[model samples]
Target: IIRFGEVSFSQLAEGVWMHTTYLDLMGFGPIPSNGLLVVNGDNTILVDTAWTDEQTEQIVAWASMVLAKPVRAAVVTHAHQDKMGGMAALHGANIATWAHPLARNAITFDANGWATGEAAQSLAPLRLYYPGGAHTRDNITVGLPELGIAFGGCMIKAGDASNLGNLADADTAAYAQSVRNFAAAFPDARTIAMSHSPPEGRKAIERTLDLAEEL
Candidate 1:
């Protein structure tokens, strides 16, 4: 029951909510990333933070008020700021934070980008998409079993942005491989939300893979 801007946030499935980003870009300049909210009853987990503090605060507060519950956890998808910058503003109730292992160094060597001061924790080294993908030297994707959503983070661009592939920092070849892996991994996922596009069905996975090959 989450609401933000034009995107009607849906529960999607148990413990899962999609906060679709208003961003739609082909590359880094216009960094558009979708964030996911995962909750285990009252204990919530945010899959990725957003662009700015105000935006982050708005979304976090919206979630808190919508569910009339508290956020107990947060996870950063990668080292990029769009996915992790709002950590400080989103902090709630002594929340425990988790992120990819190299998240600290990937984010300009800062865990929460330029936004700092809050205490954030890290997830174990994600070997899921190792050596980073075509995306970057340290890009990471998030998987929330509790919610059945896979935050592709910035691992691959959507079909709409295929013409402007890789987004510069992305590893062209490896990026394609990562996309394949993602498809195989989440074959029956409830939804696969990207930073640019709305939560997509299983076809989106195949679309991304096809687009990557064409690129």
Candidate 2:
């Protein structure tokens, strides 16, 4: 229901929506980054925030005014800006947030991430899973079994990516195994969503592993 400049929300499933926003990528010009909004009755959970505070604020407003469901908490899939960039905005709105424990330093130390521990709050039907590390040491995947959607965030690259774009903080050697574990963990998931990828299916999980191995 959110329709801002370059930010929009589209329903992907019964109670799930994909929030897409624009960001500048090195070689890809301005590209779209996506997140998920899961709504259950009057409660909603955000998988990731938009790229900026303004965008995030708009998203929250839409959730409140349009969906009539206030956001209860947020999940940061990784420490990268595209994933957790709007964390500050969420914190300002007093929204509880979570992330893999390993991402604490990357998210906190640089001051671009949010504060959260392993004992963070989790909304039901949405489970957080860590399959080692792929794009980043702390990248985590979110599973929405109720809707059969697996959010790979940035850990799983777009199908068109020739190679891992950024390796500054990547574990190339461990990436393959990590993705393998991810695929195995969500064998029943019908769709695999990523931060910058177009709509993909379970096959994307295999594609992720193949790309990881090649990298």
User: Please, what are the lDDT tens digits per residue for candidate 2 over residues 74-187?
Assistant: 777744544454777788888887665552322221222223343333555676677664245647677776677887755454544444576424676576666676677677
Worst 10 residues of 2 by lDDT: 105-114
The alpha-carbon lDDT assigned to residue 139 of candidate 1 equals 48
State the number of backbone clashes in model 2.
0
Cα error of candidate 2 at position 140, Å: 0.7
Predicted candidate 1 versus true structure: per-residue lDDT over 1-215, tens digit per residue:
55565444666666567665454456755444566666655656666666665577766677678776566666666435443456667554355665545423232223212111232223311112232333345445555544456657443335355546344345546766766666555545666666655566666666556655665
Candidate 2 lDDT score relative to the true structure: 0.70
Tell me the deviation in Å of residue 162 in model 2: 2.8
- Scored by TM-score, the top model is 2
Q: Which predicted model would earn the best lDDT?
A: 2
TM-score of each: 0.64, 0.77
Report the lDDT of model 1 for residue 161: 54
